[PDB]
Design a protein around this ligand. Structure first.
Ligand SMILES: NS(=O)(=O)c1cc2ccccc2s1
Ligand SMILES: NS(=O)(=O)c1cc2ccccc2s1
Ligand SMILES: [Zn+2]
Length: 257
């Protein structure tokens, strides 16, 4: 299977997932000078008032906080999007060190981690059908920098010792993902892909300009998770990010001047 090790990391993924070398791969470097302000972009609409978290899962590559997406209860709209996208899960990517971990970069700067809120276009009925479409998904990306704690993150960090290893899950109800957002919803957007296999080219990326602040202690607890299963040689879950991919003349658009 693919992963983030020496032998099965991002430079290997093309051998089983040839779209790895495609025309709309993610993540990318965001060259802030080349991204054009688009005054036709709308404010993003994040409506998470009724979000229903269910469970947290260590899938062997990250942890996913899963949501009940059987009704329109946590949706993203507006911004560059046509239509309504339902939140299905969020997860992060992070580094072994604070100097690396994010997947998108900004003028080649790497943040310590990046949060992805994954949503699917309700016109396609469910997530598995949406990932077959070029406008199937909208992923809201938020950078994390190390500084002051994010109080809304702490319930996620507190549960991680219960899902240390691959395949472990834990009930995770009543979690409010609004506590993970920054103040501003200014963003960049471009067309791209899932950043892990199967690397499908189905995502409208919406990357917020303003990072959130998490504490050193918060991110250290992410780095105590394991890629391995219980009873297996410990391999710390660190450096589960794909590096920036060729932009291939796509345009990155800014919502702000
Ligand atoms: N990264 S991958 O192309 O999916 C992959 C599968 C795989 C299996 C055994 C050893 C290395 C790799 S690399
Ligand atoms: N990292 S991501 O592009 O947000 C992502 C979401 C996602 C969902 C199902 C399977 C693979 C991936 S990879
Ligand atoms: Zn991701």
């Amino acid at each position: 299977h693919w992963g983030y090790g020496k032998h099965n990391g991002p430079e290997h993924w093309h051998k089983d997932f040839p779209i790895a070398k495609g025309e709309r791969q993610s993540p990318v470097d965001i060259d802030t000078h080349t991204a054009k302000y688009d005054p036709s972009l709308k404010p993003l609409s994040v409506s998470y008032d009724q979000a229903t978290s269910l469970r947290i899962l260590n899938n062997g590559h990250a942890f996913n906080v899963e949501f009940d997406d059987s009704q329109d209860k946590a949706v993203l709209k507006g911004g560059p999007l046509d239509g309504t996208y339902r939140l299905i899960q969020f997860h992060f990517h992070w580094g072994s060190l604070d100097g690396q971990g994010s997947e998108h970069t900004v003028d080649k700067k790497k943040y310590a981690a990046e949060l992805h809120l994954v949503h699917w276009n309700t016109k396609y009925g469910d997530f598995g059908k949406a990932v077959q479409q070029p406008d199937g998904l909208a992923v809201l990306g938020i950078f994390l920098k190390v500084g002051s704690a994010k109080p809304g993150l702490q319930k996620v960090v507190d549960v991680l010792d219960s899902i240390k290893t691959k395949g472990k899950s834990a009930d995770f109800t009543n979690f409010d993902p609004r506590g993970l957002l920054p103040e501003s919803l200014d963003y960049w957007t471009y067309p791209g892909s899932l950043t892990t296999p199967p690397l499908l080219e189905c995502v409208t990326w919406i990357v917020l300009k303003e990072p959130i602040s998490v504490s050193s202690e918060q991110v250290l607890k992410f780095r105590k998770l394991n890629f391995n299963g219980e009873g297996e040689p410990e391999e710390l879950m660190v450096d589960n990010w794909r590096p920036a991919q060729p932009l291939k003349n796509r345009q990155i658009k800014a919502s702000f001047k």
